[PDB]
Design a protein around this ligand. Sequence first.
Ligand SMILES: [Zn+2]
Ligand SMILES: [Zn+2]
Lengths: 270, 112, 84, 551, 97, 182, 171, 107
Amino acid sequence: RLVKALEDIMVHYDNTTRNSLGNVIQFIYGEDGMDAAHIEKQSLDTIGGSDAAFEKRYRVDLLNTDHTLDPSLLESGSEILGDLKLQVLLDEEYKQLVKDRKFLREVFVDGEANWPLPVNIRRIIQNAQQTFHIDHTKPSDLTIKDIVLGVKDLQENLLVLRGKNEIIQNAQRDAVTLFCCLLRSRLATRRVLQEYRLTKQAFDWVLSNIEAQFLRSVVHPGEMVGVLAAQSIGEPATQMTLKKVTSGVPRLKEILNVAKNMKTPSLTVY
Amino acid sequence: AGRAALYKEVYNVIASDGSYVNYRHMALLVDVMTTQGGLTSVTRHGFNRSNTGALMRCSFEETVEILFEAGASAELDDCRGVSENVILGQMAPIGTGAFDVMIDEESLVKYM
Amino acid sequence: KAIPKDQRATTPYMTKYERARILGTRALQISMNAPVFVDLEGETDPLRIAMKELAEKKIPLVIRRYLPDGSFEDWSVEELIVDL
Amino acid sequence: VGQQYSSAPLRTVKEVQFGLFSPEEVRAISVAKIRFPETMDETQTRAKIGGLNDPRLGSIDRNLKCQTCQEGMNECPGHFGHIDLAKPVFHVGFIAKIKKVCECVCMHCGKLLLDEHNELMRQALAIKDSKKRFAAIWTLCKTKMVCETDVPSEDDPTQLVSRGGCGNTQPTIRKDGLKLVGSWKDEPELRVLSTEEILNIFKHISVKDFTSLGFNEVFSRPEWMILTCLPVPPPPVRPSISFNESQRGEDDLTFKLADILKANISLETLEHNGAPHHAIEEAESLLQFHVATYMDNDIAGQPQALQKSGRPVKSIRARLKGKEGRIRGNLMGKRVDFSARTVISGDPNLELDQVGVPKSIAKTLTYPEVVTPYNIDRLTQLVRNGPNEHPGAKYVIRDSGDRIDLRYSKRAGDIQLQYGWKVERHIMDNDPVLFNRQPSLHKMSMMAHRVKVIPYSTFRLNLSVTSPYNADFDGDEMNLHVPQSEETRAELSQLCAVPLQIVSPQSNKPCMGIVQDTLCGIRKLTLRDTFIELDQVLNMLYWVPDWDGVI
Amino acid sequence: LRFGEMERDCMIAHGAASFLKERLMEASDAFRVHICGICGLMTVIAKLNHNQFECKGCDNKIDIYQIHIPYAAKLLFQELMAMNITPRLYTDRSRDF
Amino acid sequence: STSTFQTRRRRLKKVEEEENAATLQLGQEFQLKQINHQGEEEELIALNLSEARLVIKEALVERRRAFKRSQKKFMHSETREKELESIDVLLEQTTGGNNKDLKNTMQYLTNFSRFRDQETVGAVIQLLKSTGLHPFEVAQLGSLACDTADEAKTLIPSLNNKISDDELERILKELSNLETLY
Amino acid sequence: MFFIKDLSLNITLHPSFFGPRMKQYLKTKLLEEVEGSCTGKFGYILCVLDYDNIDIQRGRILPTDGSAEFNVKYRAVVFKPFKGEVVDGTVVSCSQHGFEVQVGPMKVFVTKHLMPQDLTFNAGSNPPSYQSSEDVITIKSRIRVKIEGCISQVSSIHAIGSIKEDYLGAI
Amino acid sequence: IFVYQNNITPSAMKLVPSIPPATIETFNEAALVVNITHHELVPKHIRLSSDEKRELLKRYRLKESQLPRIQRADPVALYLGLKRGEVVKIIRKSETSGRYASYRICM
Ligand SMILES: [Zn+2]
Ligand SMILES: [Zn+2]
């Protein structure tokens, strides 16, 4: 059944999920437009961790002897301390990582931080590391602008939908949102310089890769996602070889049938 | 909210076995079962009554019964359905066939 | 209905299904004694020549992309980027 | 396909228009009078009588003639015949509606039973959907049992407006066997609704009435749900089976027609002979029966029309019913050529993406290559080699659409190839093929492998690609299909090849791994405890084929 | 050997359009019938020789097509017609969308 | 076949195919309101002999030319009986050589023709095209000798009431006047 | 009467000819399967105009073999007679049952009894003819006929015409 | 908007659709004790201007019928009072991408 029920469904060139009529089913395959294949469990560091740790890790204040980047990291470090026009970028960045937090904590209440997402950034850097034999001793050479102003310019090229209007170029920001959070998370000034001493080279590379490795994870207009989805479920429904409620195969049967008289009706009230 | 439940429930039927399935799939299904209006069942009594052409619903549980009432009310079939084409021996609009390929005679000159 | 080469909206990149079919299609022709637009570095397997024509982007074909409502967009093997 | 060329342009089916046959067309189309019920024997003489099957329909006996249409057997689809009934009959599957329609319209003047006037009605006549605009109307008229002459307009319930006339009460109706009956209400009045009647009331129904009801002026008018002229499927739909000559072999269908025919003539010869008025409607049921069973046999009205020996009878419907039949078991899935199956076994010496094809099969299965300067040589060699040695071939085909059977033909070793000709050759090392293990319920239950011709008799697949097919070697069998178009292969190697299937989307993670020996063993070999000495280390190195030669 | 529902469902999955058609046609059924561009039926009396074509009833000689379809399907249709139902085969879409 | 600029949505019952006659009722394929490829509307195209002779010639010629643009890698002279040869050549060059029809169309078209100058034929057109008359008439008129309104309005009944005898007669006067000699 | 109708055709091209000058081959094949053709719905396709600006559009590649299919949109000079059309031609054949006049690419025949009365048929003539008080009709003589009815057939179109009306006869 | 307690008389209710344009709606006390829109599950909806709508179609090249629908009786549809034809934009959270925009036309 599952199969006969979704044959006709596939991802159409506009990046919508429709059947044989034209009826939209998903306006973006998987609420994100990514081909399941290109996805891995990553961690949204921004979420978990005391309000304390957060600061000590993502906070940068160029107007303070103890909350600034020690020049032992940035080439133009000593000549930054105090600069007021930077502290605004630096502060924008933080009032954002901050928004990200709340946002995430509004979506994933559990506090669970590990989720499937496109482009494995953890590893994308790991390579950058030993690919330029980055030494943890000497300092970087990134302008604070270099960083914060490229991370932004990055998000700009992570296109899923391409439309030439608003209603479309707006769904865009959406289908990406979750990703960027992870993104802004891993490419935060402090981090970028204190944890993984990237040079400008390393960075500009880490950036190129992400963009293209992302544009690869998109979903190909052609995939017959309907059938797929079906199988993906029915399949593991065959490997099912069998705390006191209707559970499993007989259940799944119930569900699909939209049965009114379920053996177990339960209901949890908090 | 219902969808959110239908999904949630279904998800629990696959997790209770320690197996993992990527959202998107159960999502899609849960969605198919819900767009239309309320709760459309994955059964002969539901999704097999929808505006989908005849020949497609033909290939499932009511066959002749469904065909009969097709010439009766003179239905028209788009032949946009997977099944449809399969029955005709035609290349269906699926992956490899979600488009057409042409010989641009123009570019077929600068190539020499 | 058609669509101007501008206002274009599809994916700048070639879909696997496309490329897959182009090579095939192209092979088929090459295998049929169609003219080959690249120097055969000595190749002799059509689908292999096809892989070559496709890397020097010298395949004279055009992928018409029908949309859900019928309108289409036309891209050339030339244009379309090939990551994969 | 078919062979022989046709100046007829060629297209693809784009729309499918489902209609109902108008006795009128049915006639037009036919080429067969079909008056007799017999089969052939023009007084035992073999051939066929201008009676049933071939009063010009298709043919048999390997003889051109198909209404001069020649071409013979293969290439002459059937050519429908017709057979004028004696009296109108119901359409076994439509009965259900023919009824519901009458309960929707009253006889005598034949017209709707609710017009724009009744308000609850308007809201129904707007529902754009013949499938619901009907199951609505009906629900509103099944109750009305009086063909009203005047109703209270959009104004005063005092004032009464006039429309159609004849308040002849409407009778409720029930289904008894293959006939419709209704009462007219002190005390009821039960009479049988003669087909001959229904037809009429329908014939008269209005054009905007058709449509208002789920119908279509051009393709399906209700008056057609009632059969008057019966199409007669030609041989190919109901072919025979000869045991050479002087015997039989007729198909089940060719009998219910034979029946229907009998039951049709017996009737007729009564309306023109001693017609004992109501001793006829006892043989008009028989027709209604046959002309009904012919199409359906699994009714609730019991009698299965068991054919001598108590064998059920294959109603046309039955041939299409789910599974094992046409739709589901012939069209949605088929037996196919260029396919092999045997037992599978592990062989830790094949690359992942390969698959051991036994020589026996590599020599059986073939691939149509097209002669090209690039190959000519290689190809002529295979052709020279013959269909018995391995790397060889077994069929050459020139432009003239003729098969040269390499195993016979006095020109076996001769032949000069011609650019354009094709050479069915043997499957060879590296021809991509689709391998698979039923039950198929994964993209991966079917993947493409590199063919590696090997001895002995078993498909030898790599171990790690085991779990996707979900197979054991405890005697499990697998199927192999062989591509055919240079573009066909393309689709296998570019989307179906195993290496591509490695990371499964059904669970955004890889789907093949390392098991048994390799696994178990890979651990031991790892341990801090485990040390290896020169003599071996060296061999091990040698085994990894991509070793850079740097001890 | 068998290439049934399930094995199809996978090719659709794979998105292997052509290969599917191939198993389904060129490697099994495959048949060349004629139609009337008027009444979408197999009626047509093709004498592939003297090119004569006709189709009395809808009466033609000019508007005629040739299509390739799985014999099983032809039969599906013929069987349907015999049950008095008409399967129209048209080579052009007039309903749009 | 050779398809024709409009897809007449044939709904099964193909029956009504009217009569073909000088009632100006010509096959559906020849109404006066047909469609051009560009997708526009355009009056029918009525060619009167010796106008056709020029149009056929025109292309058959510009054909020979562009038929040599690729081989690298108002008066004339009384080409009568002279034109019979001068054309047979244009053919044995740019024709199918098995177009016995065209040969025979060029003879007829060139023997019965009534004009030699694309200038004379030009006026013929600039004249009749003021009538509002339908193309098939504005053709039969151009390629048919006519002295009286009767010889006309009889061999072209579709005229009968669409024009006074007097006028249709002036036009006939100016026809034999322009009628190039031989 | 002769027309210039806007037509279009479909040519299936084998990959073989997918050359550099394909356009060339197409056109050429257009002209082989058109100039000299005949239909009841178009009449006589006599000549393709504007050889140059012939629109080819983009052709699509079929799907089993590589043959591509282009819808060639052209324009040409056609000619299909009608019932009630008045045209004059050159006589060709003349027998006891009548003479056949040749109007253009077509051949219209006139029945002895579809002619007038005072006109008889002289068999003992050479070449064969039809005599009258003052008129003499034979081989090369030019006549003006009124087409009474048409009949389409294979690759041609014949038709019967009369010379029994007025302003009809020789010229 | 009228609020009945235990119920209304079936003789009464059939008097609402008798004075157009004007529109009326009927709500039981017991169903308004809790705002259904505050429930963990039910995400927030939004009415779309007959302008914002005629746009949603033009941007997805959609026909009205190919759009995901919501019931005329659907709880939330009443909380906002939709009308056969009015479209709603459903904006919810997603474990695949924070926010997902969806639409529901009415029937
Ligand atoms: Zn025949
Ligand atoms: Zn009545």
